[PDB]
Design a protein around this ligand. Structure first.
Ligand SMILES: [Ca+2]
Ligand code: NA
Length: 259
């Protein structure tokens, strides 16, 4: 079931990139798998550079952890930063040098939808604290697809919007009081946005929460370890109920507990 985050486990390393192209990146599974994929299917994008187009796909967890990809997709336009997600058969990613979110259907390699996130800063305006052009961060939780960003009107505070996964329309929007560039990353669990304090520390914390159901903001002190000292991506998977992260070449996962 659902609840408030109360604990994060130790990071477990599932795969380590062998080249500088994977110093930062995004890896993910689909919380709503659709044919021909399953809950084991894994995608990995090494995101260093300026023409990021290769998406590595692995049918099996064993292949993700020990082998070569089973398929490589070449995106039709370059991707920006580490914020992408996979949801219900599509990769949702941000176009390079844009505030455009793109829905790319993985089995057909068809762009099904594109949407400018209204007012969103991009390309170094409202990144997380490490930089990396992390202005726009997609998220999946128990209720579906969201996007995390900021705007000039919000003065750089985290804004989050629920997204229609079919056509990318914004369905509802909330404004927090958390400066986006003051936190290392963020993710959503059960409709509550959580932030991480530091991308370098072994003794970081999950330090803020904003509950979209109640409008209430809280401070937290839940320990969070950046084992390799440079976490570029931290997302939540609601099917596995785990955090997925990318830390200085390493694809890692953290158990959690909800109350
Ligand atoms: Ca995130
Ligand atoms: Na994301």
């Amino acid at each position: 079931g659902c609840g408030e985050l109360v604990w994060v486990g130790e990071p477990l390393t599932l795969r380590t990139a062998e080249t500088i192209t994977g110093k930062y990146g995004v890896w993910m599974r689909d919380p709503k798998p659709t044919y021909p994929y399953t809950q084991e299917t894994t995608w990995r994008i090494d995101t260093v550079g300026t023409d990021v187009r290769q998406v590595f796909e692995y049918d099996l967890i064993s292949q993700f952890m020990q082998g070569y990809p089973s398929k490589v997709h070449i995106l039709p336009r370059p991707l920006e930063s580490t914020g992408a997600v996979v949801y219900s058969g599509s990769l949702y990613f941000q176009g390079a040098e844009s505030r455009t979110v793109i829905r790319y259907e993985l089995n057909t390699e068809i762009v099904k939808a594109e949407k400018e996130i209204p007012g969103a800063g991009y390309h170094g305006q409202f990144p997380y604290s490490w930089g990396g052009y992390t202005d726009i961060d997609l998220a999946v939780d128990e209720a579906g697809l969201w996007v995390i960003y900021s705007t000039d009107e919000a003065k750089g505070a985290i804004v989050l919007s629920k997204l229609n996964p079919e056509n990318l329309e914004l369905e509802q929007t909330w404004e927090t009081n958390i400066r986006k560039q003051s936190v290392a990353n963020a993710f959503i669990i059960c409709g509550t946005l959580y932030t991480v304090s530091s991308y370098t520390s072994a003794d970081a914390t999950v330090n803020f929460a904003y509950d979209t159901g109640t409008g209430i903001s809280k401070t937290l002190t839940i320990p969070f370890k950046n084992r390799y000292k440079y976490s570029s991506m931290i997302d939540y998977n609601p099917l596995e109920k785990k955090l997925f992260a990318w830390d200085n070449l390493n694809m890692v996962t953290y158990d959690i507990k909800l109350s």
